[PDB]
Design a protein around this ligand. Structure first.
Ligand SMILES: CC(=O)N[C@H]1[C@H]([C@H](O)[C@H](O)CO)OC(C(=O)O)=C[C@@H]1O
Ligand SMILES: O=S(=O)(O)[C@]1(CNC2CCCCC2)C[C@@H](O)[C@@H](O)C1
Length: 660
């Protein structure tokens, strides 16, 4: 750093008894700007505990203190309080911490900058900015009226220990300066994780959800994700699908590119509001992609990626359930279009993108190209792009002066698709270095049924054939999409399930040649499964796994077949929260296959981090060196308290010995 600390100490054990460092620190504090750098572990935290306190300990001044505190939910924050000044600041962010990794307490690196010149308080944990708050009336942390105690592991209020901590502070430094963002980035870290996608990267999305991982035949490992712009909200929103790969067993990852992108709205990095008045603000006029899945095709060598596609302002809540968006004429399916001013859909898209008029069966002078863009007489039509802002105190979506190709999925398009959900595919011929323009899959359940929903994660490539399968769900069933010709044509295999309107997110493993077990989310608090023994043509009844708990609403479960024997048996690995309370208590569960009947003995449970720390959607893959890569949402993506968090989708590397 550009300056030396005014105080430095270390190896403090916090065992429900605070340590007083007043004599060491208080007379060193000077000026109105301070930086606290603290390396600390808390693998068995109390419900709510202070790591560091500056306080007025005298009778009558219980509300005059500064503290850095944490919760056993993983939340970190500060309080800055002075009764005389009439100031009570509370800043925090959920899901900011690690507890344990590979059975070992994680050294978290916390940097808090209190900057009087910019009147801004900024918190970083593990190299990640979790909050930055500017105020009209700045309160320097050591200018609190009557401060007489500096405390580790509690806050001294009126002579008593409040917020008693269990943990350790291995290193703490304080500086009479607000160190710059640049200098913060030089502070050495001890992180157990890495980021593949992150705020400020090439996607310019401040948020990410729905990770995938897939190990390709070359040894490259590929990842996809929802790059979500309008906070962490599902569609309707602006969301693109981004990808990144690793050629060195997950050690380093490429700068992300888009596999599927719309441009009716600008790609903006926005700090979405988290207060109770505005947090449900939602980009409402943008088209989007959501929930991707990846597979590799042995035949063509192509990588194939599917995702749901949502027209402008559409998501699963308002998608028309009674319309596929296609017209069936003969045995063929054609995308329907509504033209500006018509109250019905009087057009279809035919072969070679010719826009046809259904009311008179004439072709028009309009065509749809390979990017689903509108051409008139071969000339590209355009629309004006939108940008979003909260400058007026609420969400505004408005034209920004920039023209972009007119797309049938856009709000401002001359021709518009049916307001319902679709599935598209794209392919890469260079293992994720570039992606083709996407194609819509045809409808599978008839003219008047909305599309199914893609199960995020991996598709399945069968070992002994060229069959490709992508699981999807809808009301009352899993609908497996099957291709035997490199994704050129698809057919459905329907498998009834005993829940109506479920989110039956399903992932498959091939237990042995032609035998597929599918594990899926339900509404019962238990993960279910079904088996196919004819490469997906037919499916067994549904069974449930005991020994793992989910919530009533459930969470995606990822699943792989391990290439190596474990305890002499074939192994399957599941990744899921294990909790009936929320999306937390992340585990990998190792199951050994009983060859006699293909039953699975769930023998090992690996705790990814604390039971109380967040874990939601996840991706797992066997890396080429036989380690396991896990990319997962490290927060509760269901909780309405943990919306719009940045850099919570994280990646770790595990070995089987860590799991057993
Ligand atoms: C297409 C879509 O909306 N998919 C979303 C899915 C869906 O909303 C479901 O109906 C309710 O779980 O929910 C979740 C979720 O965190 O639970 C993530 C998906 O991105
Ligand atoms: O067996 S595959 O289905 O082709 C696959 C990869 N197998 C290799 C075997 C050799 C070690 C690394 C993983 C498993 C799925 O989880 C995908 O990652 C693709």
């Amino acid at each position: 750093l550009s300056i030396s600390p005014i105080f430095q100490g270390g190896s403090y054990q916090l065992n429900n008894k605070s340590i007083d460092i007043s004599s060491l620190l208080l007379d060193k504090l000077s000026g109105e700007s301070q930086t606290v750098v603290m390396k600390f572990k808390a693998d068995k935290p109390n419900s709510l505990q202070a790591l560091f306190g500056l306080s007025n300990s005298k009778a009558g001044f219980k509300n005059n203190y500064f503290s850095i505190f944490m919760r056993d939910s993983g939340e970190i924050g500060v309080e800055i309080r002075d009764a005389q000044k009439g100031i009570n600041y509370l800043f925090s962010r959920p899901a900011s911490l690690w507890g344990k990794h590979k059975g070992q307490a994680v050294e978290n690196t916390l940097v808090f900058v209190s900057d009087s010149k910019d009147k801004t308080y900024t918190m970083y944990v593990n190299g990640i900015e979790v909050f930055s708050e500017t105020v009209d009336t700045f309160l320097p942390i050591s200018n609190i009226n009557g401060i007489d105690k500096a405390t580790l592991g509690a806050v001294n209020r009126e002579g008593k220990e409040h917020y008693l901590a269990k943990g350790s502070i291995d290193e703490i430094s304080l500086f009479n300066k607000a160190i710059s963002d640049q200098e913060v980035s030089t502070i050495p870290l001890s992180n157990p994780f890495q980021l593949i996608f992150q705020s400020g990267d090439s996607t310019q999305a401040n948020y990410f959800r729905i990770p995938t991982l897939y190990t390709l035949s070359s040894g490259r490992v590929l990842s996809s994700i929802d790059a979500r712009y309008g906070g962490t909200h599902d569609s309707k929103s602006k969301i693109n699908i981004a990808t990144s790969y690793s050629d060195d067993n997950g050690k380093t990852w490429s700068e992300p590119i888009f596999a599927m992108k719309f441009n009716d709205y600008e790609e903006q990095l926005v700090y979405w509001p988290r207060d109770n008045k505005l947090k449900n603000s939602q980009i409402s006029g943008s088209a989007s992609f959501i929930d991707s899945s990846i597979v590799e095709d042995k035949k063509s060598g192509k990588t194939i990626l599917l995702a749901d596609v949502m027209p402008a302002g559409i998501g699963n809540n308002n998608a028309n359930k009674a319309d596929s968006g296609f017209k069936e004429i003969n045995g063929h399916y054609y995308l329907k279009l509504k033209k500006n001013g018509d109250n019905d859909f009087r057009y279809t898209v035919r072969e070679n993108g010719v826009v046809y008029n259904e009311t008179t069966n004439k072709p028009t002078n309009y065509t749809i190209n390979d990017k689903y863009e509108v051409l008139e007489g071969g000339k590209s039509l355009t629309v004006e792009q939108y940008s979003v802002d909260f400058d007026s105190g609420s969400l505004r979506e408005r034209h920004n002066g920039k023209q972009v190709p007119m797309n049938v999925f856009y709000k401002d398009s001359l021709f518009k698709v049916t307001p319902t959900n679709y599935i598209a595919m794209t392919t890469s011929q260079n293992r994720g270095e570039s992606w083709e323009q996407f194609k819509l899959l045809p409808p599978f359940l008839g003219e008047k049924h909305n599309g199914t929903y893609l199960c995020p994660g991996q598709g399945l490539a069968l070992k002994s054939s060229n069959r490709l399968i992508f699981a999807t769900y809808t009301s009352g069933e899993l609908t497996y999409l099957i291709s035997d010709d490199s994704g050129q044509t698809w057919k459905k295999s329907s498998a009834s399930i005993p829940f109506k309107n479920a989110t039956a997110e399903a992932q498959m493993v091939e237990l042995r040649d032609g035998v597929i077990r599918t594990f899926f989310r339900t509404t019962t608090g238990k993960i279910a499964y079904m088996t196919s023994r004819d490469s997906g043509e037919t499916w067994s009844k549904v069974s449930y796994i005991d020994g793992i708990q989910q919530t009533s609403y459930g969470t995606q479960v990822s699943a792989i077949k391990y290439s190596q024997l474990i305890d002499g048996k074939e192994a399957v690995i599941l990744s899921t929260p294990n909790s009936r309370s929320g999306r937390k208590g992340g585990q990998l569960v190792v199951g050994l296959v009983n060859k006699e009947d293909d039953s699975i003995d769930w023998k090992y449970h690996y705790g990814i981090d604390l039971p109380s720390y967040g874990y939601a959607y996840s991706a797992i893959t066997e890396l080429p060196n036989h380690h396991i890569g896990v990319l997962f949402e490290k927060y509760d993506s269901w909780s309405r308290n943990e919306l719009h968090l940045s850099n919570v989708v994280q990646y770790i590397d595990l070995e089987i010995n860590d799991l057993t």
